[PDB]
Amino acid sequence: SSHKTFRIKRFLAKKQKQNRPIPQWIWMKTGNKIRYNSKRRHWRRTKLGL
Amino acid sequence: VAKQRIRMANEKHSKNITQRGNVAKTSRNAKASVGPWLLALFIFVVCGSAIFQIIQSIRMGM
Amino acid sequence: NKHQIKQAVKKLYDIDVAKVNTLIRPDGEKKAYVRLAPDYDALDVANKIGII
Amino acid sequence: GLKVGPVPVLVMSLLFIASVFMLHIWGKYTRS
Amino acid sequence: AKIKARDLRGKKKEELLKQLDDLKVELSQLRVAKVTGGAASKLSKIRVVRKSIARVLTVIN
Amino acid sequence: MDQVMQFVEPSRQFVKDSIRLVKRCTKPDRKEFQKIAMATAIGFAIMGFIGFFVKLIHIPINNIIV
Amino acid sequence: AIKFLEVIKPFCVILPEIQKPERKIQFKEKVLWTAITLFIFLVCCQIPLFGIMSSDSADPFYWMRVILASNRGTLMELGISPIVTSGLIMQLLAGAKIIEVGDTPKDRALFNGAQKLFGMIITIGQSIVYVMTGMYGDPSEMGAGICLLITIQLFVAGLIVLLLDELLQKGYGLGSGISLFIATNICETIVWKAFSPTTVNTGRGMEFEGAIIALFHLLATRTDKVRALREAFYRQNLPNLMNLIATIFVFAVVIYFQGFRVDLPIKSARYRGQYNTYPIKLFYTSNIPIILQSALVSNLYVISQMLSARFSGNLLVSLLGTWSDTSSGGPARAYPVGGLCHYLSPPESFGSVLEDPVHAVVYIVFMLGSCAFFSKTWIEVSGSSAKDVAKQLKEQQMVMRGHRETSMVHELNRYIPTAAAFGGLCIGALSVLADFLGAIGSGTGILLAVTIIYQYFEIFVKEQSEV
Ligand SMILES: [Mg+2]
Numbered sequence A: 001s002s003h004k005t006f007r008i009k010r011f012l013a014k015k016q017k018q019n020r021p022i023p024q025w026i027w028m029k030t031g032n033k034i035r036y037n038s039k040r041r042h043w044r045r046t047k048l049g050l
Numbered sequence B: 001v002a003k004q005r006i007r008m009a010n011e012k013h014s015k016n017i018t019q020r021g022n023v024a025k026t027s028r029n030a031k032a033s034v035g036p037w038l039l040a041l042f043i044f045v046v047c048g049s050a051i052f053q054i055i056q057s058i059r060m061g062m
Numbered sequence C: 001n002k003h004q005i006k007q008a009v010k011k012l013y014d015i016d017v018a019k020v021n022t023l024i025r026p027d028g029e030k031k032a033y034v035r036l037a038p039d040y041d042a043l044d045v046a047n048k049i050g051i052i
Numbered sequence D: 001g002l003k004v005g006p007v008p009v010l011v012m013s014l015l016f017i018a019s020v021f022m023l024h025i026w027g028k029y030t031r032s
Numbered sequence E: 001a002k003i004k005a006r007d008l009r010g011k012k013k014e015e016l017l018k019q020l021d022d023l024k025v026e027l028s029q030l031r032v033a034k035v036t037g038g039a040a041s042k043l044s045k046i047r048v049v050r051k052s053i054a055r056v057l058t059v060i061n
Numbered sequence F: 001m002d003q004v005m006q007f008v009e010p011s012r013q014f015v016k017d018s019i020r021l022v023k024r025c026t027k028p029d030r031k032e033f034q035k036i037a038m039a040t041a042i043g044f045a046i047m048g049f050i051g052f053f054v055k056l057i058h059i060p061i062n063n064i065i066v
Numbered sequence G: 001a002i003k004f005l006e007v008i009k010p011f012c013v014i015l016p017e018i019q020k021p022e023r024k025i026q027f028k029e030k031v032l033w034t035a036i037t038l039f040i041f042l043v044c045c046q047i048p049l050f051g052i053m054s055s056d057s058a059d060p061f062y063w064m065r066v067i068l069a070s071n072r073g074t075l076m077e078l079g080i081s082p083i084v085t086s087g088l089i090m091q092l093l094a095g096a097k098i099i100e101v102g103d104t105p106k107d108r109a110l111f112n113g114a115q116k117l118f119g120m121i122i123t124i125g126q127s128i129v130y131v132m133t134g135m136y137g138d139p140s141e142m143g144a145g146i147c148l149l150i151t152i153q154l155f156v157a158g159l160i161v162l163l164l165d166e167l168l169q170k171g172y173g174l175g176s177g178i179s180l181f182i183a184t185n186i187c188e189t190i191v192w193k194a195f196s197p198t199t200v201n202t203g204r205g206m207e208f209e210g211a212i213i214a215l216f217h218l219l220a221t222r223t224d225k226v227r228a229l230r231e232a233f234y235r236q237n238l239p240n241l242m243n244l245i246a247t248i249f250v251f252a253v254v255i256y257f258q259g260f261r262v263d264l265p266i267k268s269a270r271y272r273g274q275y276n277t278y279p280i281k282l283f284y285t286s287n288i289p290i291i292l293q294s295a296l297v298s299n300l301y302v303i304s305q306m307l308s309a310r311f312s313g314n315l316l317v318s319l320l321g322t323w324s325d326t327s328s329g330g331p332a333r334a335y336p337v338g339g340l341c342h343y344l345s346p347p348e349s350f351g352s353v354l355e356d357p358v359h360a361v362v363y364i365v366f367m368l369g370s371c372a373f374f375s376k377t378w379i380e381v382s383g384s385s386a387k388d389v390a391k392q393l394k395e396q397q398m399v400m401r402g403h404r405e406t407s408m409v410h411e412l413n414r415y416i417p418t419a420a421a422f423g424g425l426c427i428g429a430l431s432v433l434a435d436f437l438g439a440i441g442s443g444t445g446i447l448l449a450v451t452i453i454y455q456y457f458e459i460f461v462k463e464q465s466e467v
Helices: A008-016 A024-028 B002-017 B036-061 C001-013 C044-047 D008-032 E012-036 E040-061 F001-024 F028-066 G003-012 G029-047 G062-068 G082-093 G105-132 G144-171 G178-192 G211-221 G225-233 G241-258 G288-311 G313-318 G342-344 G349-357 G357-382 G386-395 G404-435 G443-466
Strands: C017-024 C030-036 D002-004 G016-018 G201-204 G203-208 G261-268 G276-281 G322-326 G333-338
Touching: A008 D008, B036 G082, B036 G357, C001 C017, C001 C030, C001 C044, C001 G276, C044 F001, D008 F028, D008 G029, E012 E040, F001 G404, F028 G029, F028 G178, F028 G443, G003 G105, G016 G144, G029 G144, G029 G178, G029 G313, G029 G443, G062 G178, G062 G288, G062 G443, G082 G105, G082 G144, G082 G178, G082 G342, G082 G357, G105 G144, G178 G211, G178 G443, G203 G211, G211 G225, G211 G241, G225 G241, G241 G404, G241 G443, G261 G404, G276 G404, G288 G313, G288 G322, G288 G333, G288 G342, G288 G357, G288 G404, G288 G443, G313 G342, G333 G342, G342 G357, G349 G357, G357 G404, G386 G404, G386 G443, G404 G443
Parallel strands: D002 G016
Antiparallel strands: C017 C030, G201 G203, G261 G276, G322 G333
């Protein structure tokens, strides 16, 4: 809702920032195995629970 | 603004059926930011340079 | 807070502040809308800071 | 325009350079 | 011209505070440069001035 | 005063803009300045030396020919 | 516009157009190409024409010879001017949109090929004039045969320059050939004068011309070291170390200001990071402005001369300009004694400046204002104004972070117009300051050489960095 607590708005903001693709220079790192961000979240497909 | 212009423009666009593939992008065909007075001034500087040098050479040629 | 923002802006850049508006952005950062006194030109001040 | 190599551009210039020298040598020699 | 802790050991509290102030002003300018198109050299200086700030504060403490 | 201010203002603004622009330029640093000078100084000498020598050889040839 | 281009199309079929380099030329090969192309140019500039008999004629364009890099009494009499004047006026027309050059490679090629056509035509016109006016003799007395050889020599000699320039620009060399040649004469001019082993039989006796060399001989001969140094510093008839000191002092000032630039942050609109910088150099218009200023200065002199020599009794003519062909000691020279042109002329020395301050003041005001005016307007002609630059960036999918595509023009408008105007005022000031301090050669020439060297160095570093 628009009516929000500071603690909830701060939790949501951190979930916003984690929800990005990995930098593409991570790919060239020497021992890298990560291909993509496997922890991407979609606001419609899966819900935060809070 | 004359509201009759909707009709005029609407009818005019409907005439585009006959020139499909070459419709004009803009009806308002009708500017150089470079002012004509200044453009002429720039011409008086650049173009003349070749011409005058010839004349000065001509002056020294007689 | 707004009082702290106002005093920091005055001391950092030696300008005068008319008022301050604040919001917290959806990414968690706080944005301050600092208005300068009518005798200061923000455009001139932004040049000193390096914004423009 | 006409397509020409770079060395021929080099060559023709050298030909022009040497030729003028020949004229200067010829001109002075005949003037003797 | 780098800041080393050995240099700062004998300095008086007032000099370190003044030395700290110069670094903090310098860092603020760099963070402006970070968003206004600074050179890669200026961006790399951010970490150097941050650890310089930590060194002075460490010696003061 | 209007006609004067009509002429004065564009002049006054231009100076303010120039000061504004210069403060925004990334002027070369001391290390940058020295680096550029060495390269330009070298290019200045290399280029002049080549012409110097080339000119010096021709002089006798030119005088001998003419 | 298309009609004008098309009428030039049939002629462009026959013109000699260099072939592009299919294989990526290595830096070592490119540098070689430049060195030979440079070396040949010098060989041509020194060689006198065949058939000349008189060369001591006075040079009203004594200044312009260094700028356009032309040596009187040599194959490079015409220099690059038939190209520079062509290059200038083509861009002027295209910038004025008189000739709309399409994005198609053919239209671009035909535009470029067209430029050459007028470029050689200027060469032909000037060369025919240079022969017809008899700046070397009397075509009746030389004889028609001699005349033709001089003309053909001049025509191809100018031709060779164009292809050599085209060769360098087409990737075989580096940078721009035109820039290379002009800077070439300037440095040789500075270096030779300092280290000239030629000596001059002045009334006092034989004297070395070299500012550096003369000091050594005077020091090695004159017991009075102070007298030797004093004499070696103020040879008003010969270059002096004082001028050498001034020339070096200019050299520093120009470097410091050549690096000035405004770095706008940009990125790719498609990919994260990839933060890049679009630089707005202080000399945005480069050396072009002062070149225009000199011509407009030259144009006024010609008009002032022609009207004075016919109607000197008219008040308007006197105000426009008055000339006296003073010929005391040296070769005859037409100097402006009265009228507007006189103030428009550059005072030679500080002493002359101090004698009549208003002459320098009016000269300063016009030279600065003209240089700024030429730069300010050249932006809308050069096709590098804010709207143009924004169009290029959008094509490249670049954008300013946090900005819409349409607000980049406004951001670019902050710096581009001001950089252009102020860019001219600074480059105009530097030429005035160099000449006032007595730099060896000319500030304009000095500015050109240093600026070109940096640009030639800029590609040097970029090419060197890749390897
Ligand atoms: Mg649901």
